[PDB]
Write a protein that binds this DNA or RNA. Structure first.
Lengths: 323, 94, 105, 82, 97, 93, 110, 82, 99
DNA sequence: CAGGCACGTGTCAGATATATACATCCGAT
DNA sequence: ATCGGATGTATATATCTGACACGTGCCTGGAGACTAGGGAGTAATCCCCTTGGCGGTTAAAACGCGGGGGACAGCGCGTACGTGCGTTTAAGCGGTGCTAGAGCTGTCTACGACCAATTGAGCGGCCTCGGCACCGGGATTCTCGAT
DNA sequence: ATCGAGAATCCCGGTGCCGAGGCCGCTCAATTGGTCGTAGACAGCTCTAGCACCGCTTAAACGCACGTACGCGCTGTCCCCCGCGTTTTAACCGCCAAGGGGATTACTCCCTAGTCT
């Protein structure tokens, strides 16, 4: 019940990220925004909000000023600043962050018109991001994402039946929409102690059926690119969506699926439960913990239920993995 | 209350590290504080002067090492350079 | 490790020397490798001074460093006397030295 | 209290003890006046700088730090006072 | 009538004052002299006690060094008795004149 | 490159005092070095005064005190008087 | 706007450049901000010192029957004066020489 | 190369001329070795600082500016050059 | 006599006046340059010296030696003597603080 | 920008320095 | 040899310090893998300035030698400075009382950093003739054995 | 106690020379005109210690007695440094090569910023 308070704090954190280049303030501001957004009360005084962890003196004084005046003088000044607003608008483009936007504003490039007029100053990734600025910012309905998941699974099985592909994230947790696709792939012949062209075959097959439209980067471990659902020859074309494909070894695949399924709060709680149960869980595998904190040989992983049973915790469906 | 600044705790830790069974008086504490401040001021001033001399705009370990070499005499300069290089290597190795 | 001093294995505060390097306006930019080197140099010099003082303190059946002991340690050594040849310490006194000419027959 | 003479307050036994600490054996009768003169000129040289330092800070009390700084300006660095 | 030979008591007091660390100057006359000298530059001044003590220690160090150099010059002049020409020579060589 | 020097100003001052005298290159270099050394000494003393008095700015007071503390006696008196006169003339616009 | 530009040294009635002194003070890392009255005072002090030493050097050169100042004249001017000598006690002038000074004992006793 | 036993290049007439500029009447015969020794000590002390200065800059030619700076470091302040 | 021989001492004051009046180096160039190069060879091998640096070293060394000789003469005059001795230089250096 | 904690400052029991008595010990007359 | 200060020994003050208790502002703060740029290292050449070699002139260094004036050792003396003792006086310690000014804090406000825009002073390049270095001889002055 | 002879220095004049000083064509740092954030000038408070005074206490300072040793003057020995004449000799100037050090480019290669899960 802090829609006005949380929204104004959101852009504040961005400025230390893209302009001031201070992560130590951006992380604190976003943590404060997240903890305030979960609090189901009207906020009346900053001292009352100081009880919540992650809220300090500066946040208190600023929310008090916002409650008193309806705005922040610092925020209002920085809103009308041409340089800061231009940097933020440039950083909205994928591939453009603090250094890139800072340099472009320094050389006069401040609007998307300048980006389109200066193709030579943009690399492949920056040009791809410029081309699909509007498409990338759109959300993906769950039905379209079901369709393209079916298409991806069909193509991957067409490459080889022994492949296993899992679409993790908010979709795996059952959310109605997502901002990107995280595709996780494994191969029985590819383990931690075992081909560099396994991902290449899948990428080439998806490009053949004209599903993947653009390639941002393609390596032996992870691939990032753009995909778009085909239209049925008469309707408007679907907006371009950025899809990420990652190849994981078989002994690490289920742990990677658990890590990328989410959520972040759920992952942190599971890591805390593992730590209090004498285990450490990471993106790759799970290790037992010794009495002195020394990690031993990683345990074999063959299912998510195995991971849950390792830390003596009941298996939870991805829909129940909100926290 | 005016929180005065001193190196007393670090000097005491150093003394316990090399001479575990002895103590030190308050007057000697003040003399050690003044000596540390004077040496720090000398080395920092020489490093800043060298940085201005070489048209640079940044003080790194090179200027500090050269200032130590210029200020401290032979054996002390060599040992201090060895200690500084070892400490820098250990710090960057982490 | 958490603090910068423990990472480099020193006893002097690296961050405090860093703060003084900013405050002392020696240059508008100071690299991160300077304060650890300066702290190591200061710690080594203090260790040598204190060790020589203790080697002079212990001698007189005294287990507490006195400014007289510091003066004896500085003046007796050759390197430290050259380093601090123009420094007079309070309650330091002077080295015992009588010329052979003034000695009795 | 306007003081008239105090250089005579640095008595002959005090000069004798200072000379004995220095390392001399026999002292002539004319050492005392010359020692008083050099003491006076050194004291004026230090005190002028100390008073200038005090006046620049718009103070009327000469602290020990001003004296230490004035001594440092002449190369006679003093430890144990700040 | 046991009277010591001239010099032995000096050879005693020299060791006594070289192994000691006391002030050797009465504090009140030195404080009065400092106040008298300082009043010539600015009237109505007040001194911290630590300032007077620091002045006394600095003056004592300076005078001890001057007497050391004076003794060196006097021994170089084939004598054991210091005379003001020795002090003047030491001050002139040191760069103070 | 464009190396800077007080040569023209030294020559102007020389013609301001002795209209019918010359100066050689070595004497001009010595004068330049003297000017640089005096400037470094005065600026360093002023910076030390600013740091010692917990101030963050060097003003006419700091420069005047540094001049009174470095230059000896009557030279310091004349320098302080003429510097005060110059500051008054400049601030009078 | 844009009135007739005048050098601040001309405003202060000085020959030395107050602007260059200000730039050197700002770039010398002496203080993080420099007041406006410091450069004019410093330039006036430098001008006074140069005028004094140049007047003495010119007097020495005229006494030496030369109309061109050489380092020997500068050394003579510096060492002959009392306050300038103590101000510049620890400096060596290149090709300056040594003032003629012979001890009375070394003179022929006759 | 390998310059060796070259301190003797400072000839006895050169030392005599320097002493005459100093202003001495007559010169003992054992003074030249002492003068050469103190000259060597002073030259080594200055040259070590000059070489250290010309090494921080990562350069192989010793400029006069480094010599002037090294002289200024120990309180000589050579005017003229630079 | 057959030759015109000056008394010992006048041929001192003559050319004392000369070497105090004039400002040349009084030390040969190449021997001093070789000495500087040989001294610097000990610290770092293969080091080049500018001519101006050698000249600056020569000026500084000559000034230092002249000052030391003046102090030595003063000490000799103090010792009721007109001949300078190595112990006089030792005393002057000890008083000056270099030893 | 924010908590964790490393210093700063204040307190008090107490090792360590110092002063005060008597028994040896060594340089002068 | 014996008598005054150094030593040592036991003991009794005493005192300034080092281990706790608590408050408060510094300070150290997501890791990894795939993409680029970019400093660093090597390689390769252009000025070119210092280094090195050969040869000729000659001013300066090296060597010999005859003194003679000063370094230096020994003797005598006289008075200045040491050590010791009685007497005074002023430092030193310990209280009491007062308040001038050091130190801290809140508050505006004038001042200096900073950035477009402008332009005139100072620096690099290029003459050139005049103060000055040098040579030559005559006049002036300094020094020394001789009477 | 000067005087003539021998030698060192000054003065006057003449002659060539190279850099001190002046002029021209620029470049870029000094100057104008504004905005905006904050260092500190200036009042107001506490309250610390610096100053002034007084009263013992006794140890340091001072004046004097008196002895003797050391600073200083004088005298005599001798020795070694200075002045001058003769004999090397390498300092110095002239020329050449020359060769790697400073200053650029050419190419590559690992280090690292970005960037996005």
């Amino acid at each position: 019940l802090n829609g006005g308070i949380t929204d104004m704090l959101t852009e504040l954190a961005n400025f230390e990220k893209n302009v001031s280049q201070a992560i130590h303030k951006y992380n604190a501001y976003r943590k404060a925004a997240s903890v305030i957004a979960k609090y189901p009360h009207k906020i009346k005084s900053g001292a009352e909000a100081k009880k919540l962890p992650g809220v300090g003196t500066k946040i208190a004084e600023k929310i008090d000023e916002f409650l008193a005046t309806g705005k922040l003088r610092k925020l209002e000044k920085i809103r009308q600043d041409d340089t800061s607003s231009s940097i933020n608008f440039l950083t909205r483009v994928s591939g453009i962050g603090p250094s890139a936007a800072r340099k472009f504003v320094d050389e006069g490039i401040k609007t998307l018109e300048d980006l389109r007029k200066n193709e030579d100053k943009l690399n492949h990734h920056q040009r791809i991001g410029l081309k699909y600025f509007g498409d990338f910012e759109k959300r993906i309905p769950r039905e379209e994402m079901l369709q393209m998941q079916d298409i991806v699974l069909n193509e991957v099985k067409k490459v080889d039946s022994e492949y296993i592909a899992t679409v993790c994230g908010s979709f795996r947790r059952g959310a109605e929409s997502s901002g990107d696709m995280d595709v996780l792939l494994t191969h029985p012949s590819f383990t931690s102690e075992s081909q560099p062209k396994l991902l290449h075959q899948v990428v080439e097959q998806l490009q053949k059926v004209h599903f993947i439209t653009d390639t941002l980067s393609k390596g032996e471990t992870k691939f990032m690119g753009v995909c778009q659902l085909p239209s049925k020859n008469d309707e408007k074309e679907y907006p371009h969506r950025r899809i990420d494909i990652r190849l994981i070894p078989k002994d690490q695949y289920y742990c990677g699926v658990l890590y990328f399924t989410g959520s972040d709060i759920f992952n942190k709680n599971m890591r805390a439960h593992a730590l209090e149960k004498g285990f450490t869980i990471n993106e790759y595998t799970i290790r037992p913990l010794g009495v002195t904190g020394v990690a031993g040989e990683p345990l074999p992983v063959d299912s998510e239920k195995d991971i849950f049973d390792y830390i003596q915790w009941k298996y939870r469906e991805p829909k129940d993995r909100s926290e | 209350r005016s929180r005065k600044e001193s190196y007393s705790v670090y000097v005491y830790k150093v003394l316990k590290q090399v001479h575990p069974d002895t103590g030190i008086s308050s007057k000697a504490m003040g003399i050690m504080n003044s000596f540390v401040n004077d040496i720090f001021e000398r080395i920092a001033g020489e490093a800043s002067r060298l940085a201005h001399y070489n048209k640079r705009s940044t003080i790194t370990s090179r200027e500090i090492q050269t200032a130590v070499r210029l200020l401290l005499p032979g054996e002390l300069a060599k040992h201090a350079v060895s200690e500084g290089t070892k400490a820098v290597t250990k710090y960057t190795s982490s | 490790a958490k603090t910068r001093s423990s990472r480099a294995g020193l006893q002097f505060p690296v961050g405090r020397v860093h703060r003084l390097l900013r405050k002392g306006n020696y240059a508008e930019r100071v690299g991160a490798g300077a304060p650890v080197y300066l702290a190591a140099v200061l710690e080594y010099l203090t260790a040598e001074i204190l060790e020589l003082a203790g080697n002079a303190a212990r001698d007189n059946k005294k287990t507490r460093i006195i400014p007289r002991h510091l003066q004896l340690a500085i003046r007796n050594d050759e390197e430290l006397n050259k380093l601090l040849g123009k420094v007079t310490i309070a309650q330091g006194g002077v080295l015992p030295n009588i010329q052979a000419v003034l000695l009795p027959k | 209290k306007v003081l008239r003479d105090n250089i005579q307050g640095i008595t002959k036994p005090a000069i004798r003890r200072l000379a004995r600490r220095g390392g001399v054996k026999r002292i002539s009768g004319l050492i005392y006046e010359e020692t008083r003169g050099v003491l006076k000129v050194f004291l004026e040289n230090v005190i002028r700088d100390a008073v200038t330092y005090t006046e620049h800070a718009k103070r009327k009390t000469v602290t020990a730090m001003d004296v230490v700084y004035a001594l440092k300006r002449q190369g006679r660095t003093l430890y144990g006072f700040g | 009538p046991h009277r010591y030979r001239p010099g032995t008591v000096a050879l005693r007091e020299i060791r006594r004052y070289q192994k000691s660390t006391e002030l050797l100057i009465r504090k009140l006359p030195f404080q009065r002299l400092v106040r008298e000298i300082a009043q010539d530059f600015k009237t109505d001044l007040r001194f911290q006690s630590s300032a007077v003590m620091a002045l006394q220690e600095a003056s004592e160090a300076y005078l001890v060094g001057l007497f050391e150099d004076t003794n060196l010059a006097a021994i170089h002049a084939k004598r054991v008795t210091i005379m003001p020409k020795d002090i003047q020579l030491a001050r002139r060589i040191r760069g103070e004149r």
